[PDB]
Write a protein that binds this DNA or RNA. Sequence first.
RNA 1: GCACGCCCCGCCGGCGGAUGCCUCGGCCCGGGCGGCGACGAAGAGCGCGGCGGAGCGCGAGACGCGGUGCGGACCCGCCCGCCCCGAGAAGCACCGAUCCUCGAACGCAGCGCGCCCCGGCGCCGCCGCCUCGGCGCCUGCC
RNA 2: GGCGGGCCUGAGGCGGCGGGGGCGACGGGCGGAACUUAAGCAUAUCAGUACGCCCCGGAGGAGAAACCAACCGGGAUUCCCCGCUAGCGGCGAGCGACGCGGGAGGAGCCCGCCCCGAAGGCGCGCUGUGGGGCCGCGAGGGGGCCCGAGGGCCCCGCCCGAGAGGGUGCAAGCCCCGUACGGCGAGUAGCGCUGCUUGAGCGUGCAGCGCGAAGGGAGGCGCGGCCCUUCCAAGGCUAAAUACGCCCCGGGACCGAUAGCGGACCAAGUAGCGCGAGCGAACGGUGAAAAGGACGCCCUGCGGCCGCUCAAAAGACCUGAACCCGGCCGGCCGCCGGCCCGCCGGCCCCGUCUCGAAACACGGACCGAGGAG
RNA 3: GCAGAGGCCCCGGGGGCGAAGGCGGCGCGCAGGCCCCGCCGGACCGGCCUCUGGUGCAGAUCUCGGCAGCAGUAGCCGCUACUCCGCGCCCCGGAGGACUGAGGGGGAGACGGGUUCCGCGGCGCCUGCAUCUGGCCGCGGGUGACUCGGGCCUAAGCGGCGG
Lengths: 133, 88, 50, 117, 136, 53, 122
Amino acid sequence: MKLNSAVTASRRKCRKAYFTANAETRAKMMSSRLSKELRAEHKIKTMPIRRGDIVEIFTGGHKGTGKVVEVRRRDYKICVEGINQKARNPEAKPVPYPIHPSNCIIKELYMNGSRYRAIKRRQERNAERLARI
Amino acid sequence: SKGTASFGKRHTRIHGSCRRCGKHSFHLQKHECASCGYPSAKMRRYNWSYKSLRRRTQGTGSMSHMRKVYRAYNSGTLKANARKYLAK
Amino acid sequence: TANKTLSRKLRLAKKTKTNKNIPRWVIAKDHLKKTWNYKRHHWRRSHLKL
Amino acid sequence: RKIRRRQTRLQKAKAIFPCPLQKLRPSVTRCSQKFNLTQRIGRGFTLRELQGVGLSAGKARQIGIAVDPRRKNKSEESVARNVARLKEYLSKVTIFSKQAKPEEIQQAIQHQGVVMP
Amino acid sequence: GGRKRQCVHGISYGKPRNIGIVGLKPSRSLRALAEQKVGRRLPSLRVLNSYWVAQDGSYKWYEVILIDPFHPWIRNDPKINWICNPVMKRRECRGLTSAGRKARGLHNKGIGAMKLRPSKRAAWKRNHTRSLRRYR
Amino acid sequence: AGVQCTAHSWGPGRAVARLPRKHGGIGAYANFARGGHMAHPTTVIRRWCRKVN
Amino acid sequence: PGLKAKDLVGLSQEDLQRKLADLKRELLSLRTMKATAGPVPERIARFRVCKKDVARVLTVINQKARDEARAAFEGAEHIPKTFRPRLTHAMRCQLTEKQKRLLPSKLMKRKLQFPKLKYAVK
RNA sequence: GCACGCCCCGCCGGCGGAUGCCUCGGCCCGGGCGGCGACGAAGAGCGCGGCGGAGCGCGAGACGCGGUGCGGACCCGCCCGCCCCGAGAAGCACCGAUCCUCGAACGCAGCGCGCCCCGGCGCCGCCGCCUCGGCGCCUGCC
RNA sequence: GGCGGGCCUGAGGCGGCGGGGGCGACGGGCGGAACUUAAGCAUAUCAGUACGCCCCGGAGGAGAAACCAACCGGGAUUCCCCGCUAGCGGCGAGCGACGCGGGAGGAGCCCGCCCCGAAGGCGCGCUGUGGGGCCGCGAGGGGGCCCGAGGGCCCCGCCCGAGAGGGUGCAAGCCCCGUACGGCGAGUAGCGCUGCUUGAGCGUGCAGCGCGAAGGGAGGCGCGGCCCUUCCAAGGCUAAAUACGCCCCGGGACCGAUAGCGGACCAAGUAGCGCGAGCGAACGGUGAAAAGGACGCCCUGCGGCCGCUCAAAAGACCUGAACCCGGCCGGCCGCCGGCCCGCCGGCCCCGUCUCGAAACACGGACCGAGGAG
RNA sequence: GCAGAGGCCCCGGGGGCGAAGGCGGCGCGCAGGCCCCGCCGGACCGGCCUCUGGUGCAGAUCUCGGCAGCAGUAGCCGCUACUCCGCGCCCCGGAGGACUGAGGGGGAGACGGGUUCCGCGGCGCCUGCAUCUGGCCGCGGGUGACUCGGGCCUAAGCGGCGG
């Protein structure tokens, strides 16, 4: 059970948080498990999804691997490259099938310079936790 | 003649717009506002209608200065207050 | 009326300026679905300043 | 309300660790013939009761004994009962003075509830 | 003189007990009326107390001591800095002056004053409150 | 609840029912009416706690 | 993105005042072009950048004048209301802690005569 | 008779929005708070977005501007703008300003009109100060 | 009769500062109803209420006895528990405190008077100043079957200081976010007459007026005497315990779109109505994803058709009832009973008051939801 | 019987291998009702014990929503009036025939409306028949003053005034 009474277990209040979250919270909420190779490399279980990330969806329709090309935060869904809806005619624009970030596992990350710093910041806080918090 | 025929002779505005409340309540002959109370300095509020009180009240508008100063009191206006209370 | 005052004319001109339908691009951006302003007034059926 | 009142007492108690929350108050006969032979706690010690222990009103209040200058004893027995009660408190009270020796002020135990009920 | 009720045409329509306009006696003394009148005339100042100076067949004169709460001498004075506190704003409007407290009956203690202590209204509220405890 | 409307009965002689009606004749202030008060509204003064020795 | 405040903060007031007039004249041209655009414009991205640019230059000018004036009236009795500590209306009119804790000499001496002792009860 | 009209041996279609299921909303009950204003409040009017109606939010520096610390890639349409170990999208906090007209509402009216040096120009109090009135109590002088 | 100076009373300006107005609660001060109850109605009650006005504060008010008592006494105020009686009242209907006692919480003081007199807060003042919370990590799941999609089913593990919850394509401790675990005293008292008020009763508290003390007040039946107990009014301050909306935060044996706020719908005090004060709605839900309808055909075109996307059109929307209606399709017509089933036999329109209703008594076109111990 | 609560439902109740609900049809019960089956539907649902109630409708000139017969019914009977041809509309152009008849169905203002004004396009709304019309809808525009009026003066009046 939860001993911090300051937090809410109300279905209505919690759902409002998800539906109406600030962008900075929406981004963390949209996170995906790193692959076991990346877990050994960066020593972090999950990273928030970015645009340039190779991802393997283990979902039911559209299971596959792809690089994210669009992150739609308002719908809370990401669009990898490759995974698309069936096209009515061959001569038509391909529509990406929106996939939940939770339905996919990251295979490669866009390291940037802020992402390197963020992995370091988390690694330090995780080490302090591992030292008997 | 008591009804529709006499409705034809209506062609004047007895109430104009109020400087303070912006409502078609400012009598133009008597120079007073039916709802705002203008030209009185006290706003006209009567507890018999709470619905009227709800229609024009704090919070039915921007509440700009108050919102910012309430937020500031929650942050760092109390500490600035302590410096002037310490005074000289 | 042709002998109006600027302060009556300027409050009436706001209504003429804002009697507009939602821009079509706004409906597309917000997925509004309801495309009627509902604050729009037609001179014959309306009584502004009343 | 019980929770808020406990917290207020706990926070006030913390603010004066050695000092008890409650001041010594006198043993007074419950008023009326219906309770003549029972005693209860009263607002404060008379100045005659105070002279039995040789304490001024200021000193008594500074050492946590309440003082009532309004109360008049009304009997020789009341002075003696209250003078006795002050002597027990004065022996029980320990005054921490001349530089706060932290381990010895920390060692001190706050008395909780009515002093000498 | 005594009060005359402000009812138009001298008529107070209602049950017979409330039909009377000229024999009423004011609820507050003239000493208190004087303080309230000089409080409206000067809302910036605070009212200490009032003394009688003179009387005639139609008018009584009372003299009131008013304190400027924001003067340096008054603010920097331990004896009178209490008036500078904001709670003492318009004391004569709230019956806290001696004359006002005489009208409320607070000049009396014990028997007769038992139902008018925090206020006559507050005693009525406490006495007539129905306390529905959780275990009743 | 149900009593912030201003409704007074139109009365006998308008071929309507006698219940309180608003300005347009919309029924109001009655358990049967839509938007009317409950006939006996719930209260917070109910005894919630029972006593056991 | 347009002007950065850091470049403007370095500039002297005279250069900042020319900078504003040039952006104001440019704004009249940008608004004239929109009026004469007819069918449709090219999004006029320059227009927003130069409306926010006018704001930045005016912002820096105010800080340049506000600080200057705050320094000139520093420690003077009765400084301007704008530079006075913000507080609230009530806080200005509230008594200082010293004035609140001021005591009559007899009440001060007696408080000194019996200090608040710390004591424990067995 | 037929058609109609019913009844319904089933089948199919309208019309309506019941019933279910839900639900970023209420409502009750606890806490916390108690923080507006002549340094211009609350309220109101007008305006402000590249393409802009309502709402919001702002105020001619306008759908915002600056500072500091987070944050770390997006910004609902079309855009164009970012992207890069900082270069800096969304978002978050706190602070500095800007803040049109009305309004306690303050040169006078409410949209028109002054006086006056460039500062300005409302009222009532308190405390100083400056000027000065009185066949008030006097005092010289004449 | 002028001419200056000091005092005193005023006048104009200038400077510094302060006031004003807002808040549907709580709080103080006043002005103050009536419906109602009395089975009528005047006193009474409602009610020292609504409402009007004034005024603060985070609380306010109250407050260190001219107090209660009658004891083998207590000891400012406020608040709670208690007795709810003592009393009041066309002694009718009704109304109504308090002391005890048990708790919460506790804290005391000042001015005038008098003494000194400018030592003071010194342009004043001797008509008296001064002294006496933010930040932060965060555990552990696979295989098969099947499905549009597991979060399902079957086998078998793992993490639990975490099996509160929220999301994710179906019901997830291990897919994600989180959760548990952290870190940095005089025109007065009184009295006389009057009026309001109280349970206060030859007077509970006030008040007008007339009169006006010096030792004085009180002790729940007036008046005169004598005691006894017990206090010191006509000046002021004061924390705590207590009350409470807006707003923020959590929770509920609450409501679930005719319900719950009037208002769940991106614009509700809105749309609309009223000359105005004011009044005041309706409107939730496509899907997992807009994939929001491929292509061919016939159209002058409108649009039809074929089918397409989808798990499904779910096609402007979930489910899709009843009333009512149209096509086809039987049948001949209401209820009850018998029988193969269209014949025979029975059969007034219910609810309602009422001695008595099929009544030419009343309400009821129909159907759905809501609707009263 | 309903809606919730605390339990139970022998490997941890029933459920996308189909929940609630809707529609028909059996069975069971004296009945309130219950069960099952097919179909539609597309995510939840209970049996039993204990508990709680804003707990069951035919009526209230009941509320609110829908909606029938009537019924293709009553009506679309003020202002004398239209016709021919031309894309031919009640539109427009030409030809006729008329009407309002200078207290006008004329040309203009005050007030009240507040964009109705103008040009262009359009018929989905509206134009109680139609429309190719429009005061309707979309788009773009439109009101220029030393001499006209406001502003100024005073009127009836109203406000201000040490108080």
